[model samples]
Target: NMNEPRLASTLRGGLIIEGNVEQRLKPLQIDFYSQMTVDGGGWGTKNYIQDDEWNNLVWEEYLKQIASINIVIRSLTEKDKDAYANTIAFARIWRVYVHTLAADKFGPMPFPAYEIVEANPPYKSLKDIYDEYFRELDAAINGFNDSAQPIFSDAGIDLIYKNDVSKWKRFANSLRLRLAVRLTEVDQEKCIAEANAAISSPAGLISDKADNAYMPPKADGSWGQDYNYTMFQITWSGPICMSKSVEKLVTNIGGVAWPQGVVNQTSGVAVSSVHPEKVDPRAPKIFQPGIENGDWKGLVYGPKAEEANTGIYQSKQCAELGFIIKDGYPYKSRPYDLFLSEEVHFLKAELYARGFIAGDAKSEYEAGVRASFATWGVTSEVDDYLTSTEKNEAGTSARYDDQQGAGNTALEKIITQKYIAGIPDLAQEGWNDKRRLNLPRLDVAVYRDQAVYNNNDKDILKSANFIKRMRYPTKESLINATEYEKGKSMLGGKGDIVSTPLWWDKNSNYCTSSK
Candidate 1:
């Protein structure tokens, strides 16, 4: 009887953003995993066996639910007025957030003027969708700024901010910055203006521990899709551990080794260097250890070169979300994070690095790192981490110059660090960043020794041709053919193929690895 953990889970789960390949296999959301494997291989194997329509089947449910929320908001604005002002503001912000996410996947969606029961609502271009998001955010900000105290604090119903108006304002602004940043390559001038607006706004961005946006556990004590699809799935065959890209970033930047237990999962793998002395302290904190070396290890993201020797390492990143496994037993279900202060700091760092905004990029970068360590409850270790670049040392310079040895750009360092900060929960955003900026150069696997190539068009997989955007569901054509055709037209005629670039990706050529 609350704001929508059920609906939120459906949206989040449809994308299966968390975990490495082996870990993902444990609880395969067949639709999502299959796509990840065959269509994209950065995080896991290419199944190459299954192909299904990705018309975004859940789009209807997503839009309907959003429409339902809008109805509540309209009623509150009309009747409850001041009592529900803060509540209305909260609802609007989330409505926009959900809308942005939906559009990110399906390209143009009916929004801004979308109506609950309106048949065949026309689609809005991505540019228009973003414009509406900014407008709605402005309203939400004003709502939170209202001095009229909320009729009652939303401490109970709202899962993200406890109905705290001020915190909600920060989240709204932070989200604005994120959306604005997406337009960087396409519209640099507008991107800077929006970033500066978010930074300069009184509500401010999410920059404090108290300001992090999290969805606490449902009163029912159940971990939602995140756990249900990965950790809580059947034992022998769960998702794999890590992607090669993530593995490289973690080991090189953090100096963490895969736990011995994880190493033992694969027989005959080298076991000598997997010691705690060489490990990033944050490693054990975020990744579960295996039985052999008692350390963390990751599986290659794409098609498996060979069958794995053991199950993948379980991620401890979600441990903070109340999905921890203690002595082989999963713990109490708790709420999960939606956004963090560190993300804002990292965004600011990137803006500064690109000269889009003011201030020293390096300092902002360092602050982002500190905020992440604190979020993970590893604050005491921060000082040590900040000072050293030694492999086993905690803090080392995240500067571009310092990172080149590791073969990454200055932008790459910041985004890679951000990726590490996001871990099991923020994989979707990681994928988004990868698509938008192509930061953190990842390996395109050689799809070797596959049982069958699923797509009749291609006999084999091309790792680089990751699905860029989801196609509109087939049913949309039947039910709303007119609007569907309009949407397809916006996609540059190649209706819903994985390779068709989105609006933001039009300038993707501007981004490529230095090496």
Candidate 2:
């Protein structure tokens, strides 16, 4: 029965969402995880498809979990006498979090009503979802403040944060900020107020790694039912290789800091004498480049990357390229992060950019750099990279369009570093930032359409152009017909089409070279 795997299923589902989210954020890590290779004509083979399919599963499985959490949310609140006022708040926090991610992926969706197995559960507007969650976040802060008696029953039970309420609050607020930021293009006034409220209210933002939310693995790979077993039914590769774009991003940021200066959309190849000295040294942590500390050490890929150093390569290799290896087990990855300090710092920088926050751009920009550096185990590199970079003191006043102009150099400096900090979370954000700020120039590939590397059908490769978004899941055609029709009406067609932008993506900028 569905009830048998119900709890285990829900927890496992949450872990997958968390893990997939982290994998998507890997651009900030070293180039090894390679999602961008799909852009390189590798069709991204299996890994690309993994992200595409897994993201769908995240929304799908989370719904299943919500179906389960609905039972708990209903029973605990209705039955237990004074269970914990915060209990309902906790439910809301978790509810809004998962729900918002769905909205982020596919726009407004039906929020399951507790025990209401009615044919059609009423759907909340995406805006309403954001508003409700912003309110719920406020209530959560109040709940923690009022009750000193344990806020998380499962910090050890689930213990994703090891029972830290402060960290939990930071996550909640950071998410709230993200939602608020999404609205800025459409609803400026409300966006500003909500964002300012998040910044001003001390529920505390995710300023440090300690305040982050992530899922650590349980023994036996129990949380990873699909991944450990390779249960992907979709053709999105079970076997994978590194992404080309990711490798390029890592190489460009790590090996050298090119002074494209925002407008100079150029090759990943470095140019000398143009702001040569100061680059983010943390780039090395992600790129895995050559010789350091007297030994010949560098980032490895393909076969050479796999077999080089005995223990370091962690068993990752490509059939096409030679293998290289190093010291550690390469298979395992870090936790799935919900919110990172780097994101928060950038959000704060955005606020400062808009004149809502009081700090100068450099302070906010530096905060983002530090947070990103520390999160990736390279705190020491912050100095060498940032302090030494050629400062664009003039660009501080420049807009995204004029970042190359003088007097806005500070703005250019802020953005370039922000781009570096955003590496980890760039799965879609890289594209998003291009839409927003359009800086830290990148080049398009010369090959028009490359075949996918690892999949069975060679023709099914991603075209030469980068994929903008995922297609809607096929299930809506069968499981939820009437609601699907309603969704189609709201979404402007069957959700199967990938071009339909989410409500937040109101920006009309079509695909540019920077896009």
Candidate 3:
């Protein structure tokens, strides 16, 4: 119902331009946005695991592409020349981006290569993989110099920035900062050093709304595959409702006049019209009302066996994803938020809140929300939303003036706001942050009987708050049995279970911990 055109940076920068268009190299829609958000994070749940084709997608198609890019990287030497230097620099970023993504998902995988490596290469540790990430990001950052290179010779080759070296530098630096902050829990000393360097480095960060590394939608009106080709095809049929984790966080927050609502189907009565301190302005943008009620409601994850939403397998009682449905504006041209500006702000807020860096946590926290709001085209309501001192049901606050409760509260405030700012787009980060700091608590299987994992045992579903990493894909064991065993060993005694926490996930409730 809030159909007002958003005033976000529609011409904002893009990592993949000419539309979030078709691409085999990065089907970010399917991999990053969908799987990461839907399953990686607790944004929602699925009744079953339907992804048997990923081995082909992840290993064969995706890795094969990355490997191809790697081959071109070697051509920058005497065997080749400096002619390929600039593009080679750009190439390394993609390599790191691709491998880092895969490693983040399935810990301790091979570095992803082509004919350059030995037969059936060995899997590396997360520490080992992360070390490599720093190396290549630095290399890529250094690849860009003060003046424009011979980019005009191949202008569109660097389509994202038209060979604007500084922008690419910021991209590299911001990603470094992201990885640096991610490690504070497991490797505090290293994370602090890396974070500081990224902050102190001459290279820049994505501090402005225009710097958001988004992927634009198709000019032809077709979202195409990169935007999760027929993403609606999945939603068009079923599943992908809002999880209680997201629903609760977004609902009853932000005092934006509860724009549009519907009468409950079952109750045959109008849903509450009473004004809230503020309903989250972004909430209406992201989701519609419940399945039957047609009123805002969340699918309380794994609430009970024979759950009401599952009785017919149509996600009836939960809130439907607004982007998928045809009701309100689904933002057909909305750029895919690959790495947004708010993330950089929130990361800085977390750094200060956790005492990792010297800065104003409150101010940075305030900035993060506005960046997010600006991206959503709701900048007009940002100040009102920021003033809201009301806490979500999870006990996190928005307003920055108060101490709340010292460092932990401040830290939670940062992460919680980051969580809200990210929403469905960065749900994978939602998953990661949930695991690392255990802040912005997520609702998981509560019924004990409702908890389900491999073998339908319900017994091994670790924390009820949220799940940990995903189990290794089944194909790994069959094809690369030796390295697969090594990978499992690297995962510690937890074996290859979904409950197993990654090294960076200190899994401690204390978000204020410096180590």
Candidate 4:
């Protein structure tokens, strides 16, 4: 954030201006949020896994925004603090979200040290950082009081909840739930208690369409459907195309039956199965046939991406480019979503499936699928999707009553649905799921004799070589060398590479539970 960009700085001090800043820098702000999601999804948006001088802005943006928001929270005047205590609470919750998101990507990073008024800040481990986040949310959630008058009460200013302090508390509880879910593989006691708290909170979760949180596009810029950000890639037929991960998740599965007179497409072109007949209804909602050849082609991810999906994937509209965009035709496109009812249902479904909470897993799972269907405006297919017994490639079924038949587990089915609904948004969360549970086994990146960072060879296929976290920014080493070294050392001495796993990413087959 040190002379990196002015827009982020503008967003940081948005409170001082009392919320006229989002309009000034919505696109870059949107880009700041979406860039990591795009890269982490393996969607082939400029790979910045390796830290360099040129790619420094990637993580720098996350850090700067975190720092900027901290400034706003710290800058709150006593008068403003009294008048808009809820605003500070909302900012704190937002700060926790932003910081957690960044830490998940970069492992350990420098946090503002209040020990002394100085340029050097203290570096923090991901575990420490996550603990801080939970603590922050605890304070923010309880700090919210409807009694406090909002300083600026308008949809144009707030953009997310619009002075609805109760919704903000609900969002905080949901945020806690998200953090708890992330800890499932590493700390089950914490996960269970925290998730249960979020579920049991009187404020409630984002369990309905009204509570769905989306950042609507401004007049100057667009996000979500018919978004301005995706035009460069889709309209120009650029590098961002449908990935095989998504194709694999959405085809020949989901208990969905093919429509009448569906086109029979041939395979053998790539690793992905061309299933126009047995396709998931959400497939058409996300992508269209390729421009190069009117076929539903998906680019297999990895070093051999160019070799795998060239002529066939060209001129295709990546309505889900950056993993979150819709065409907005016959039906209007949805706004950029941050959190929604479907995701909450999925979390509950998984929690129940794992025996972490007291609820019917099957009910939550079906409800999640139903919510996603209605969200995408494909309510007609909801009943069919839930009732079909068809299994995905991993051998998991979409039926409400189905158990872990055909080799895949119930967790696989849960995560697979979450991953699919993650499309056109929530790609970042999907990546986190893959890292945490490694469920819904995806196809490995084809190395193809190229020298990849941590992969074995072209012959051996594995997703372990997939990037875990990006290296700390180059600016960290240049300006904040002392603190950077401390943080780098905290990366479990894994040598600051692309393949290093974070605290929550474990290889164990089983994690602990309070039981």
Candidate 5:
């Protein structure tokens, strides 16, 4: 199945690399990617000019795969009609998947007008792209049925859902819901229309664990799963620990359940739990604790190799930070996740809170928490964390407490819980959520002390504010100047800079008066 490689390169390969490389660093070695997100004021690195050649090449590969799938869809129409409908529906859903991911990053993309032979294709506005994908998904839903199994069931190539057309239908609607929710702030009426359609779709959303859209490891001899690739990077690369932002959030909920005496170089004292009495049940499940009275500490978000090596502030002999990797690390080493049941529930919770739908926000919020716990294999802790109001008041449970939660808005509770639910696996989406909602407010830390690495400058440093979006690739300017200019015009005459906001982001509270 071409779906296999499409996912590996775009979703697995592209998403993993972009989240780790472009945004933060842990497992990977320092390079332009890490530098831009960390020390260079969250955007721009020394090698940025033409440095994105690798990404450009990867983008072309993704396009070629789409083109190949298109040719197959066209050729098969001459044969069986059911086969044509089934394959075409499958192909279109995946096509939208890849195209949406690209548009979300680059603002506009060549779609609805994508031509395999055209050397230069014009990019469409973000709204047009989103609208087009919605229509494609609707067509896919109409084509799918209970009995139409994938044509490649014998080959076992449908690694994602295993040729179960029903699951594909569910995944399609779930994805549509995800995209629809993104338009809440920009176009409330359209957002509600699309979200309600997805909710009422005969295929339904991914509400159950069995319905989650995840890519399980291949049974075939050739191992090319994304989780395996991520694990390989983590194990082979020099020790990668947790980030301070992660450490702070996890610790604040409760304390790490490690042996609790291991000191970090920064404070010259052993790391200790911030809330020793109120241990988060999810802590041990999420992070590996230290042994022999040692506590797990995280590395700063962005720092040089030398700075990380110092035992004073950054690290302490490559100690374990949290439980991101271990034997049977749920989403890693076994399967790679695209969407989760909890994410859907959380989106519904937010929608209810915002009065976009009629439902109980608190109940949806609790259901979301329970779903996350179940997904993590900690279902036993759900009642204690959600019920037992006395325990929650005592800071032992995770029940909603308007007083304890950071912000005053009910939306704050929804997004904060969503952040916790979407940790190491959902990095890119987490970044987008934070940028869009500005919930679970994260404070930035400086890696280097000197002004050269601190201030926002055109070359060395870009913006003190967290990066909004990545710059358009150098390839766009060099090879596709006309389309590139069109893209800039769509972005309101601003070049590809981190400060520029997308059309959806233009009205967001976080982004105002775009550069």
Candidate 6:
């Protein structure tokens, strides 16, 4: 029924996006934590004996949210033409984005479209879902661009677009292109055509940071922790640190050193491994970094170090990552300029590769790198990194050789640079790139034997060196027996828990070890 308290149609609609964001951000948090725990960037869970791949948990939550959003789309699309115009637009993009996220995580999903499900309960096939996304893009662009009427007073409720109909249209088209880019393997022809069509349409791509969707980070309050605390009584603590992969990327990319006055600079036998480096730039805002007492610089590291060291995994930063903690510190949204022209230019490069568009590939690649650096507050170091002869292409020291001429695989360059640009979004496009086109393969965490190392249980995709897909949630088999059984049976019941390869990751020859 559409009348229950929590399940009321209105309440459910609200949760569709809220839950989606929550679950989406959780994976990023977990991935970053993995960097800290297994990669030795920092952090450790208090319960060292138990391992967690919490990121996967978020993916599961995302699926549930996707279902809810679908339900909302189903309920409202036909209700009222004028009032629902914006709502329908929201539903279309939301559905595509959420579904795309699932596909990115799991190879494919059950897109409910069966007669039994489609009417009152549409059970859409995964393939149908993919097709529907493209169809919806056409609809979204139409609905968004039509200015003849007003829709449901979107001003107050539009989190991402904020009543900017044009931007919403752009988002729809951008996502459509994203879908096309994602479907390269299963349907190459359609991918190229749809990508070209979407990019060429009036509903083009996200070309500015101001246009990027963002949830303003709240102070000391984490979205996950706040929910867990209020709904399940979970507390927040820390053992969290930066992941080695992320830290290395950030430092190598020209990020400034941690401000000089923060971290302890003292030397001792026990602290030899701890070179006198600047404290993490984000440190003081998160926790105490420098010395105690009035000695801003001279204060000796004493009880605080012991407390901080022991409290590593138990600190608020480690555990409570929800939107906000009671009175503590507010949840902090990591700064990102969001979408920019650089990412758009890179996408164009992909178009060029597939014979869908005309553009210079090498220039786009270099532009993406330069733009990405500028977007993230590292403008000062961009020149040195790009121009140093020791690191430049001419000197034979550039990390990657440039592609020239029409035959060069612009698709690879586009995907690679986009991957680098994605960083830690809930759906980090970089991971998607690895899924679609493997490049800059990351290694196991530097400290791979840490308690958290085994949690992810990374498997090789095509070969021994490639990372396999995440295992399905074992607990779902019990809680959602009917749905779980149907889904499992669809996979031919092999149900190989740890080693099962998802459909998309089926190229054994592409496996790193095999190559």
Candidate 2 wrongly placed segments (more than 4 Å):
1-12, 15-58, 114-118, 145-149, 152-155, 219-280, 289-327, 331-333, 356-358, 389-419, 422-468, 493-495, 508-515
How good is model 1 by TM-score? 0.78
Deviation of model 4 at 284, angstroms: 0.9
Task: List candidate 5 segments past 4 Å from native.
Answer: 1-51, 77-82, 112-119, 145-151, 218-226, 229-234, 254-279, 289-294, 303-306, 311-332, 387-397, 401-408, 445-464, 507-515
What would the TM-score be for candidate 5 when compared with the true structure? 0.78
Q: lDDT for model 1, on a 0 to 1 scale? A: 0.56
| Number of backbone collisions per candidate | 41, 57, 4, 1, 14, 51
Highest TM-score against the true fold, candidate: 4
On residues 1-515, what C-alpha lDDT tens digit does candidate 6 reach at each position? 23112122322233222333443332322233222122112322221111235435544555555556566555554554455566666666666665665555444455543112343222233466678889977876787535433333535455455567777777777777777876666677887888888877976677766566543322244444222212221222222233323332222222233443332211101211222232222222222221212111111111122243343322222211122222333323332223456667677666665555575765666677677666555556556544432211111222224333221233533543465465434234654555455433333322222322353544423232333344445665576566666555544434513233444444332222211
Candidate 4 clashing pairs, residues 3+ apart or interchain: 324-424
Per-residue CA lDDT of candidate 2, range 1-515, in tens? 22223433444454443434434423221122223222112222122232445445556666776777666656655664254455455555776776654655566677776645645675566677677778877876666645443534444554456556666777778877877766766677777788888887777788777776665444345443222212111122222223333332333232235323211111112222322232334433433221111111222233222243234332122211101111322222344445667778777777677665566655777778777777666676556545342322212221232344432344344545555565443434445444333333333322221233223322211221222234445676578777766666666633445445555555332222222
The candidate with the higher TM-score, 1 or 4, is 4
Error of 1 at 417 (Å): 0.5
In order, candidate lDDTs are 0.56, 0.47, 0.59, 0.59, 0.56, 0.44
In candidate 4, what are the lDDT values of residues 39-98, reduced to their tens digit?
Answer: 112222123234254236545555566666666566553336665677677777876776
TM-scores for all candidates: the values are 0.78, 0.68, 0.80, 0.81, 0.78, 0.66
User: Could you tell me the lDDT of residue 172 within candidate 2?
Assistant: 79
**Which sections of candidate 6 miss by over 4 Å?**
1-64, 112-126, 145-154, 217-239, 246-342, 350-357, 389-417, 445-467, 475-486, 489-498, 506-515
Compute the lDDT of residue 269 as modeled in candidate 1.
29
Question: Which of the two, 2 or 3, has more TM-score?
Answer: 3
Candidate 6 local Cα displacement, residue 397, angstroms? 6.4
Model 3 stretches astray by more than 4 angstroms: 1-56, 78-81, 113-115, 146-159, 217-226, 233-239, 260-277, 290-293, 303-317, 323-330, 405-408, 446-465, 511-515
Tell me which of candidates 2 and 4 scores higher on TM-score.
Answer: 4
